[PDB]
């Protein structure tokens, strides 16, 4: 996918664009797991 | 039965009853001809194509056949009368009228 | 006894109130939105026989204890009911002090403001949470969708809206509700089965019936040929153990319950099916959003969990949509939690704590503050 | 049983169809442009329970009978509906044979031709009136204005155009419509009141609400200071008997319904207020017509009957117009009938019978005749 | 006003000019009453 | 990181701003001259939702984002709009520092000077390009023509002039504009199709329609016999997929849109067709330039790309010109770029760098410098 690396290296907020570009309607979830990590 | 122009099927000469949902059909091996519904001469039928004046119209590759068909629901003597499917290819034309007599 | 706080991700799922925390993964709170009243009072030694512990125990007390939603129609008729509902939450299952954990607040549209006004202040006074926040249940499934574009079809716990969206962009004008609740289907079910040979009215009787729907009741894509199927199809013709111990026989109902969501004739409702509410919405949408929808035809609402849900969704849109465009309704299995999930998200969205309802902000502007430039 | 004939001055006021005769003074016909469908059919002995007598009875049958405009958007979607609508007219309230009385025909612009084509022929066949004629509702208010110069602002039964004129001289290029209908305002009203604590969707529910607007709903010239006024102004804060018998309370809405005609943000419409549609029209007008307008700023449309209608009209033009010029909008109270009145006139204009649509003329040229050099 | 007499004595059609000159946008109405008279 | 520089061949094609470099071959910049405003603001987590990234993305945001040309009438009403327009260019698609690359500046006549004044200075301050320069779009197609003699008919991106020339020699006196823009044709199209059964007003609705013209809309040489043709000619009678997914049917319009450039009666414009603007110009030209014209009857303007463009051009000139003389209108297919091309040329004309607008020159003489003996 690279969505992992590309979102970690995505522009800080535009993980919006990258997640929802690569199908990740759960940028919600991408960040929420990243938050269970960064909570 | 009756002579055929294109009209491998022909929109019939409907001696229907009132309520007889009647399907005037040119199921004809089919540019595919455009159909021209007419009662009257200044007078279209598309402005009257409604649930009582309804159409199924679709081509076949297997038989090169296209269906013009006209189911007539709630048949009424007001629509007892003459009707027409003038059909034209990119080159030809076909003009022959047919009957709707909504009896009763 | 820890770091700053965890927002409270509290979610009164239209039928059940539910909740976890920010960043949580499972609403640790889930349970009925009812209140319960015994009748008789057999003189009974001792005590412990609460009038109103409905929460998640009172269905244990079903029968003698009756039923009360406050937000009966997604409409809180009463609030001390819901008040102690919260306390129950935050003290038995949340068993947690509001005062130190933020919380976002789930809400569907159509509310007259004072509902939230009151809920808000009282949640600061009774609760003194570090700060609250409110958010449309609809929107909260929306991010919850994450397909920021497209409508979502929220027919959930007991709710129903269409939520046209567009990279977060939704048109309220095109947005709508369908009064239908799975409770409603419940209703017609009682209607039918009872008249069909059954005497099924009682509160927990409604309990069983709702269970029935959510376990067995379905819908078949078609109806009329699917009606002939019903005419003799023995497979459906299945009786299910009535939780008395009976085995309540079932046939055409299983499906003839929900489907009316497309034909409130059965509920007799003047309204129209949920599909063409989608479609007239979309037509309201801009010219070519519509394909956006097609890809974004997000259903939402677990009670709608039935079979073929999309099956119809697509077939009728089709029946209405230009085949030119390619449709795709979107419904995760986990639609109940979805709303909770996205709320977890947003609230958990640390770049966003600015929004939460601070005690003070309300204090200076009272509750009315909530409204403008905030909710 | 009399002399030659009286032309039929038949006027489908965008909401109601209305009519009198040539030289008449009051449209003896006035009533809703709806069709009505009951749902249930309680088996009911006997008959007389028409499906579709909407005309002016069916609101008696409101609720069980639903609602249908044919010209829903000033757009006749269906015509046998409107057909028997006419017959109803000409046989119950007109109770009169078309065949022997001429008639002019009210129409707004923007119609695709076949609409009139069909209406025309069928009105000769079903009707055999001595001869018909058609005329733009817009134009028919225009003479109806009699200020042959200047625009008119037709926001009427449910319609909206600007009608720049000039001793009869109007520029279609500068001429425009505003999709807004009092129905539209109706809409946002339902939106608000319902969400504000009300459950108001039903057809005749819309009936009540439209009644509400046309009886009580208004607008205040200003908004923002007029918003603060709303912030506590108790005088407005008036509840009105809901025709159930309820007394539907009313505040800021009364006015916050219509005013959006200047700000479709509230309807969310991309469009712009009716005033600057006037103003951009006028600017389109020649250099010094504009003062003509100012004197001729004729409003039209009763639903716009609200308070301050001109009040704003002038104030904003002002806000836009050079004070150099002196403005004057023109709106009679009787704007509904005005259109009827001027149509009475024209048709009644005996120096003008040459125009009427003769059976024959159509016969030789079918309907298509209508179009060129005639309408 | 004299609009009455001046329109009765107005040039036959230019009652247009006279009515609309003397404020009578209802030359429409002037004739329609004259027509209720001459109908 | 290279040699001296490449002039910036930046070309705000009346509809799109475009550009490459000196000596370039394809304007690497091409995109709409609009600004876009969403309405609703669905509360949307996060950001990235620009108000005004129109450039070439915002049509992605069409609908919710509205439309804004600064040079709406070839008239820059606003400039920070166009300012960031440039920056967008020079930083996203030019993604290049102005400060180090010269640039010539495309402009049509009729501009009040301060337009360029301001554009100039600000382009030195915000931009610090090594030096600028400005040049009439008209002239820039002219060399762009390279037939230094003869008029050119610039009806381009959205522009219209006649450009009599003569080995570089043009008479401004005889030179003219036709306010017509393909946008204008757009307009009448909306007029017709909408009234003809369509509801087509929205910004990107205009987008679709302009697409429609530039893909399908045409003109037939003749009209009246070509009108009878229209009377039944089924071939034209073609519906085109509306980008909703609809298939917008098309007939007589396809051509009845543009042709009015010869008869603004349809636009109602007092003006006269583009052909006789050519002809009265030429008659203004000296006695025997006229044959020069004939050989040099250079059309310009892609939107005019339609069929028969010259076909008429010649036929009517004929109808007016003495057959004695032999006519030849001149229009490359590549007329959009032509202007860019000739600008590339001139600016790229290394024997010509003396002309460019130096920071200093402006500094000593401020902007007013630009005017005399320079532009």
Describe it.
The structure is cut from a larger assembly and holds three copies of chain A and three copies of chain C (375 residues). By secondary structure, chain A is mostly helical. Helices cover 64% and strands 0% of the residues of chain A. Chain A has helices at 3-8, 15-21, 27-38. Chain A is globular. By secondary structure, chain C is an alpha/beta fold. Chain C has helices spanning 54-57, 80-93, 113-125, 137-145, 182-195, 203-215, 225-232, 253-256, 274-284, 289-295, 309-320, 335-348, 359-364; strands at residues 8-11, 16-21, 29-32, 103-107, 131-132, 135-136, 152-154, 161-162, 176-177, 238-240, 248-250, 297-300, 329-330, 357-358. A five-stranded mixed β-sheet of chain C has the order 3-2-1-4-6. In chain C, helix 4 crosses helix 12 (335-348). The two termini of chain C are 30 Å apart. The chains are: A mainly alpha (39), C alpha/beta (375). Chain C binds chain D through residues 109-112, 171-173, 265, 268, 270-271, and chain D through 39-40, 66, 194-197, 201-203, 267-268.
């Amino acid at each position: 996918e690279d969505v992992w690396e590309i979102l970690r290296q995505a522009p800080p907020s535009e993980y919006e664009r990258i997640a929802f570009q690569y199908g990740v309607t759960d940028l919600r979830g991408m960040l929420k797991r990243l938050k269970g990590m960064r909570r | 039965d009756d002579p055929i122009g294109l009209f491998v099927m022909r929109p019939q000469d409907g001696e229907v009853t009132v309520g007889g949902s009647i399907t005037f059909s040119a199921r004809v091996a089919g540019k595919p001809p455009v159909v021209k519904w007419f009662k009257g001469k200044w007078v279209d039928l598309s402005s009257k194509v409604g649930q009582h004046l309804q159409l199924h119209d679709s081509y076949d590759r297997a038989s090169k056949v296209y269906l013009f068909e006209l189911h007539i629901t709630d048949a009424q003597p007001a629509f007892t009368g003459s009707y027409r499917c003038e059909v034209s290819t990119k080159d030809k034309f076909d003009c022959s009228n047919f009957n709707l007599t909504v009896h009763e | 006894d820890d770091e700053e706080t965890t927002a409270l991700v509290c979610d009164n799922g239209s039928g059940l109130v539910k909740a976890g925390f920010a960043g949580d993964d499972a609403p640790r709170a889930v349970f009925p939105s009812i209140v319960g009243r015994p009748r008789h009072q057999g003189v009974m030694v001792g005590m412990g026989q609460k009038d109103s512990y409905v929460g998640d125990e009172a269905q244990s007390k079903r029968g003698i204890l009756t039923l009360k939603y406050p937000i009966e129609h997604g409409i809180i008729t009463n609030w001390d009911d819901m008040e102690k509902i919260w306390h129950h939450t935050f003290y038995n299952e949340l068993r947690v002090a509001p005062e130190e954990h933020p919380t976002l607040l789930t809400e569907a549209p159509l509310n007259p403001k004072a509902n939230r006004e009151k809920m808000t202040q009282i949640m600061f006074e009774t609760f003194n949470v570090p700060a609250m926040y409110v958010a449309i249940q609809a929107v909260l499934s929306l991010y919850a969708s994450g397909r920021t574009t497209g409508i979502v079809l929220d027919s959930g716990d007991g709710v129903t809206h269409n939520v046209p969206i567009y990279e977060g962009y939704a048109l309220p004008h095109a947005i709508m509700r369908l009064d239908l609740a799975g409770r409603d289907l419940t209703d017609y079910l009682m209607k039918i089965l009872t008249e069909r040979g059954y005497s099924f009215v009682t509160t927990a009787e409604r309990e069983i019936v709702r269970d029935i729907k959510e376990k067995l009741c379905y819908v078949a894509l078609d109806f009329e040929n699917e009606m002939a199927t019903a005419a003799s199809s023995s497979s459906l013709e299945k009786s299910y153990e009535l939780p008395d111990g009976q085995v309540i026989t079932i046939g055409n109902e299983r499906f003839r319950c929900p489907e009316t969501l497309f034909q409130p004739s059965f509920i007799g409702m003047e309204s129209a099916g949920i599909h063409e509410t989608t479609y007239n919405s979309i037509m309201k949408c801009d010219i070519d959003i519509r394909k956006d929808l097609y890809a974004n035809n997000v259903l939402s609402g677990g009670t709608t969990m039935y079979p073929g849900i999309a099956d119809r969704m697509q077939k009728e849109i089709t029946a209405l949509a230009p085949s030119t465009m390619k449709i795709k309704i979107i419904a995760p299995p986990e639609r109940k939690y979805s709303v909770w999930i996205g709320g977890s998200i947003l609230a958990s969205l640390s770049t966003f704590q600015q929004m939460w309802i601070s005690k003070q902000e309300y204090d200076e502007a009272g509750p009315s503050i909530v409204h403008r430039k905030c909710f």
